[PDB]
Structure 1
């Protein structure tokens, strides 16, 4: 009785404008009799060319000549002449290409699945072997990924509105008719579903159909708050492993095609910290490589400290590119990752297409001051001195992993940590709760992912990033005569109280053509705090500075 599944037509529902709507305009534009194109499209009914195409018996390219002959046949009976320019191939290329995802509809399908619905796309479609077929493929992938099932007439050999396909749908959904709502823009397609007893919504305009669907499901789908960007399910990702030297292999996650964009997380994070950027960046036309940095996750975590100086970390990233066969990548870092990407740009500009850092400014080494002196001359960096002694901070951070990340991963108005009193107090969590509340930015499940990751190797490796102050300083001094002249983006976050925006104020002295982004009401954990804003800044910058 209570709905438990939602089925969406594609053309005219999830994807607008519908092909019929474009063809309708094509008829007018070309001064053809009203409906002639639709007549030709449907000639023969169940036994005609278009039903054979929709059942997969023939390909779209095979079907164009038949469509052409139907159009001639139709114009002849109508005592009209088709234009000299008449091309079914061009007409459908246009129509197919004009079709965009109906975002309010997709987001309602997503909301329904979030609340426990099985969702499916049921569409009459064709095997597309046009030279331009990649466009449609990209559209289906982007929709496909958000649904439990994609049922295509041409893969199952059945078409709407044949009753057999709705029985196939119901068996695929493992649900009974009255448990399913089906949305289609063609009433003929609803009749058989209605017969079986499933709820049907005839989609004329999206918002009316969404109101009907809100009513029958009891879920608010119209006027919902803005949803977060698509996240990553770890077990659905492609996982990559590259041995950069004996005993040291880098793990990374890969999604998308196009120019390589390597994401480098900070302390104490993971490739998963980019989970909101990976699908967006892949969707925007990039090949994203989200890495578990050295010391983290499934990446090797040797115990020696000097394995984590910036010079060794940067050479390994370079080896990573070599072994993957990438002459270049865009490097996008956050926190310690942002520091690493700056030095990638300073020491290996030929391998860096463009560099972006979130939060972490480029601070040139001061040759007249030991890095220890400078750290001591900033109370907010006091916690770093606490990280110096091997084993001390490891023991506090490894004691209760859930508490560690629940205490760390918090929005600016939820913090339970005072980074400036750490040494004095003898610890990072000294005056922090034993069972902190779950921040709004994270779910218990996301927390548990990080917990599982850091069970592999703990915090030794990740803390070792802090234990090469002098080594990094000596190496960084070698670059004091350089400038960064490749495309470069600095993104500041208003409420990062450690890496404050002001820290970046002098960066243009070393990066003259630096581009900037700013995110308001954003704490240190920028990617999960303001994912939608990050993705907009990053994607805009990529398209203007990293793509050709």
Structure 2
């Protein structure tokens, strides 16, 4: 049981086939002139040779023209003065856009165990604007197990061989396979080989039919999550910033550089839902394992975690990567870091953005410890301070830990006030915590494996400079942030409440604002789709311009 989708007319709706007609009307041409001239000679014909990979698209155009001279000639018509097949097809190809709901379906069947595949008759595109084809072929490609292109295999639909071929690459029986296609002709050979066939016109009936024979709802199915990340299928980067300090990250996409700075205690993976989005949106994403986390160096000394050096190391990270600047987006402790970045290295910062984390001026007259007791919900911060105590407690049950922390607003199971008195952090929580809606059991275990490397010393050391940070932070009390910034608040984040940012305007005049209702502190996994909305808008708006 597996499912195969044609490109043109199935997953990519405006059909190149249909734009021909629209040109015929538009151009006052004899109905079918272009379509008939498109396939003159059958399998010996220019088009078939093209589908077989025998000639490039640019090699085909002239070959397509001549058909139209002849085809105009038999019907005894004229082809307009500036009539050009190049232009007609450019617009068309680039007029073709994904069919989000069909794609939706593939993703569901897939997620439901199905082996999926795009089986398309397609040329080798060597136009100048070919990028727009390659660009879309990537969007799609990824959400399928296979892509079979007529031009590489050397076979075209409806040659029964490409079907067997597909069958054998599928490793399935004809009876196990569903096959949707806009071209009846191409259904017949699959049909008569025994597989299911769906004729596609409206996507709605095509899907009704699909859910019917799969026994899996695809039609009007809930709002599906943004595309996530499989650590294996990723690109992983390593840069030494210091002799005993390597930073690790994940690279994806092309465009201006967007640098994602996670929080405590997370990993590059804490961005899984936005990493594909931003790439698609057209940026170059680089998700940090922040110092102390996972596959990045994790030095035991407290002082190697003050902001100054952490930023000193991001700069140096950009040094060794060929980057003048990058846009810094952070969350939790990362959102803080990003603020020092905009504050001490405007040069190197295209634009800054924080998730949850507010810009708080450092009080000259107030040792940040004093400012710790106030606001009672800041008790656990204390509990960390002492090297040893908390590390032990948090490294004791790894799985228990992340399960206990990673929870939606209401799934909470911790009261992070009275923490010190309580004698610990999970003092009054389970050891068997149930699994949140936000994470699968496999997305938890991942975090588990990252920390078996460096433990919690490092991450907890971020909380162990303050006297030092604060002091560094005072120097910048003269300054204002005048680069483009975005502040995004979460409703149900008890620790970092929207109202601490209330005063950020005194400091960042043209601060943009994003809010998110019904959202907790794990803004990335709790509200992936909205996080995406707010950040992509501001990126197009405020980054590259």
Q: After TM superposition, give the deviation of residue 443 of structure 1 in Å.
A: 0.4
Aligned twin of 1:201: 198
Q: After TM superposition, give the deviation of residue 491 of structure 1 in Å.
A: 0.2
**Aligned-residue CA RMSD (Å):** 0.4
CA distance in 2, matches of 1:240, 1:547: 24
Within 5 Å, which residues of 2 pair with 1:253-402? 253-402=250-399
CA distance in 2, matches of 1:496, 1:12: 45
1:160 partnered with 2:154 = no
Q: What whole-Å deviation, never above 9, does each CA across 1:386-406 have from its counterpart, x for those lacking one?
A: 000001100010000000000
Q: After TM superposition, give the deviation of residue 273 of structure 1 in Å.
A: 0.3
CA distance in 2, matches of 1:85, 1:515: 49
Q: After TM superposition, give the deviation of residue 139 of structure 1 in Å.
A: 0.3
Within 5 Å, which residues of 2 pair with 1:120-519? 120-519=117-516
SS at match of 1:220: coil
Q: After TM superposition, give the deviation of residue 376 of structure 1 in Å.
A: 1.0
Q: After TM superposition, give the deviation of residue 134 of structure 1 in Å.
A: 0.1
CA distance in 2, matches of 1:483, 1:140: 45
SS at match of 2:134: helix
SS at match of 1:466: helix
SS at match of 1:100: coil
CA distance in 1, matches of 2:277, 2:77: 49
CA distance in 2, matches of 1:23, 1:246: 62
SS at match of 1:221: coil
SS at match of 2:521: coil
Q: What whole-Å deviation, never above 9, does each CA across 1:100-153 have from its counterpart, x for those lacking one?
A: 000000000000000000000000000000000000000000000000000000
Q: After TM superposition, give the deviation of residue 195 of structure 1 in Å.
A: 0.8
CA distance in 2, matches of 1:309, 1:405: 25
CA distance in 1, matches of 2:70, 2:372: 83
- In structure 1, the gaps of 5 or more residues are none
SS at match of 2:187: helix
Q: What whole-Å deviation, never above 9, does each CA across 1:304-340 have from its counterpart, x for those lacking one?
A: 0110001100000000000001000000000000000
CA distance in 2, matches of 1:426, 1:484: 41
Q: After TM superposition, give the deviation of residue 357 of structure 1 in Å.
A: 0.1
Q: After TM superposition, give the deviation of residue 76 of structure 1 in Å.
A: 0.3
SS at match of 2:473: helix
- In structure 2, the gaps of 5 or more residues are none
Q: After TM superposition, give the deviation of residue 22 of structure 1 in Å.
A: 1.1
CA distance in 1, matches of 2:448, 2:15: 47
Aligned twin of 2:43: 46
Q: After TM superposition, give the deviation of residue 23 of structure 1 in Å.
A: 1.1
Q: What whole-Å deviation, never above 9, does each CA across 1:272-292 have from its counterpart, x for those lacking one?
A: 000000000000000000000
CA distance in 1, matches of 2:110, 2:414: 36
Q: After TM superposition, give the deviation of residue 421 of structure 1 in Å.
A: 1.7
CA distance in 1, matches of 2:90, 2:399: 53
Q: After TM superposition, give the deviation of residue 55 of structure 1 in Å.
A: 0.4
Q: After TM superposition, give the deviation of residue 433 of structure 1 in Å.
A: 0.5
CA distance in 1, matches of 2:486, 2:429: 35
Q: How many residues end up aligned between the 2 structures?
A: 545
Q: What whole-Å deviation, never above 9, does each CA across 1:451-500 have from its counterpart, x for those lacking one?
A: 00000011000000000010000000010000000000000000001000
Q: After TM superposition, give the deviation of residue 408 of structure 1 in Å.
A: 0.3
SS at match of 1:215: helix
Give the TM-score normalised by structure 1. 0.99
CA distance in 2, matches of 1:258, 1:175: 40
CA distance in 2, matches of 1:68, 1:391: 77
CA distance in 2, matches of 1:81, 1:243: 67
CA distance in 2, matches of 1:464, 1:202: 61
CA distance in 2, matches of 1:397, 1:33: 76
CA distance in 1, matches of 2:423, 2:28: 83
Q: After TM superposition, give the deviation of residue 378 of structure 1 in Å.
A: 1.2
Q: What whole-Å deviation, never above 9, does each CA across 1:361-393 have from its counterpart, x for those lacking one?
A: 000100000000001111011110000000110
1:78 partnered with 2:75 = yes
CA distance in 2, matches of 1:333, 1:421: 28
CA distance in 1, matches of 2:178, 2:11: 15
Give the TM-score normalised by structure 2. 1.00
SS at match of 1:183: strand
CA distance in 2, matches of 1:364, 1:426: 32
Moved over 2 A (4+): none
Q: What whole-Å deviation, never above 9, does each CA across 1:18-46 have from its counterpart, x for those lacking one?
A: 00111110110000000000001010001
Q: After TM superposition, give the deviation of residue 16 of structure 1 in Å.
A: 1.1
Q: After TM superposition, give the deviation of residue 227 of structure 1 in Å.
A: 0.4
